Design a binder for this molecule. Structure first.
Ligand SMILES: [Cl-]
Lengths: 215, 215
């Protein structure tokens, strides 16, 4: 099947700026049968461009497409707030039809440091034989941040998971939740539970901690 | 207006069978070829199957051939996907989509329905407090549920500002877990009541958890 590689993976831009997205095919696309779709989180894809360059009905002037053979381009001349989304290219000239992995167009704003909070496991959970420790990084930009867990100065590995929210519609920030999962027996063996945050908006790492069994 | 409304998704067993439906309105359904397209969690879009307007011609991706059957009932304006011999790898959001009658590309997509294939049972979440210790942060840990989704609201929808409900993570146990957090004035902690309202419809779990400072 034809493989479509999109670049870049992510584009950080401001409203009003120009966006150029690339879609490169592993084989020549037949008859310029290449489409571009917009997708917002939790929503269905929306057709923007068919036939490499033809705007679908209802699609604003600012969107255009060009290209042939193996190299294709989506252009948004002047980004509106609603244009920030994921964009897929798709070839349908040679079956099966196939999609690129998508380019995300994100709002670029000023660097904002995360507000960091640490949460101890509740007494209720500890009854079940498991302890979950949570670290919140609130309202930061850009998206990349690093979270290290430390249990009495011992670095943790293989026992945490993270998830990040979608870019906030009001302030354009991200938030991250990290969860450290320990058996109660292991949790009870130690005192200091610490979350160390590294981010561009911080001059040096930010540690939040608590001691097990102290109000 | 054109609409495609999907139903019939949910949690099903490996080797099991499930039928998806797509109800079409706002256009002459019988005049257009129709498609199913899938998006596995966190990944790309994959075309599954297609059917001509009359239903006389059907097409399948290799990964579903001999297991899935596409069909339509033009007198009911309904498109079907009969999924037999299901595998874990069939787990995806499934979209029905309409083909452009003139230009050949997919031009309208339904919102999508989640299909989860797993041997694991439905399981309601335990809801644990994330206790608060300028600005204070508090929340609820929604732990060990299956399948997706859950919904979380704060104070029956009265509290929405500063709320971050995180995408769930899939744990190695095969169960999901998410946090929902909110940042509030730390002076309000003593007077203001904070309750998280958690719904897991697949297990009929409803939990209202009051989140209080712990001493
Ligand atoms: Cl047809």
């Amino acid at each position: 099947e034809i493989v479509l590689t999109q670049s870049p993976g992510t584009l950080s831009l401001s409203p009003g700026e120009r966006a150029t997205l690339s879609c490169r095919a592993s084989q020549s696309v037949s008859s310029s049968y290449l489409a571009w779709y917009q997708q917002k989180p939790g929503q269905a894809p929306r057709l923007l461009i068919y036939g490499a360059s033809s705007r679908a009905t209802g699609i604003p002037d600012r969107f255009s497409g060009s290209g042939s053979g193996t190299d294709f381009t989506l252009t948004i001349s002047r980004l509106e707030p609603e244009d920030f989304a994921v964009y897929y290219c798709q070839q349908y000239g040679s079956s099966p039809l196939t999609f690129g992995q998508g380019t995300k167009v994100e709002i670029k704003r000023t660097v904002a440091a995360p507000s960091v909070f640490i949460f101890p496991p509740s007494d209720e959970q500890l009854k079940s034989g498991t302890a979950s420790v949570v670290c919140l990084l609130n309202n930061f930009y850009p998206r990349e941040a690093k979270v290290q867990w430390k249990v009495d100065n011992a670095l943790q590995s293989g026992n945490s998971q993270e998830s990040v929210t979608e870019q906030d519609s009001k302030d354009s920030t991200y938030s991250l939740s990290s969860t450290l999962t320990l058996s109660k027996a292991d949790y009870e063996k130690h005192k200091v539970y610490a979350c160390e945050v590294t981010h561009q908006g911080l001059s040096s790492p930010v540690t939040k901690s608590f001691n097990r069994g102290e109000c | 207006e054109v609409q495609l409304l999907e139903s019939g998704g949910g949690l099903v067993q490996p080797g099991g069978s499930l039928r998806l439906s797509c109800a079409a309105s706002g256009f002459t359904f019988s005049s257009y070829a129709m498609s199913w397209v899938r998006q596995a969690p966190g990944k790309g879009l994959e075309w599954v199957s297609a059917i001509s307007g009359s239903g006389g011609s059907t097409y399948y991706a290799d990964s579903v051939k001999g297991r899935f059957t596409i069909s339509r009932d033009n007198s009911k304006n309904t498109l079907y996907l009969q999924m037999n011999s299901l595998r874990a790898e069939d787990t995806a959001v499934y979209y029905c989509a309409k083909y452009d009658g003139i230009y050949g590309e997919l031009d309208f997509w339904g919102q999508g329905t989640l299909v989860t294939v797993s041997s694991a049972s439905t399981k309601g979440p335990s809801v644990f407090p994330l206790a608060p210790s300028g600005t204070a942060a508090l929340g609820c840990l929604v732990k060990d549920y299956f399948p997706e989704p859950v919904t979380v609201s704060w104070n029956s929808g009265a509290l929405t500002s500063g709320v971050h409900t995180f995408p769930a993570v899939l744990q190695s146990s095969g169960l999901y877990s998410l946090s929902s957090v909110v940042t509030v004035p730390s002076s309000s902690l003593g007077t203001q009541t904070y309750i998280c309202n958690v719904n897991h419809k697949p297990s009929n779990t409803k939990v209202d958890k009051k989140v209080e400072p712990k001493s």
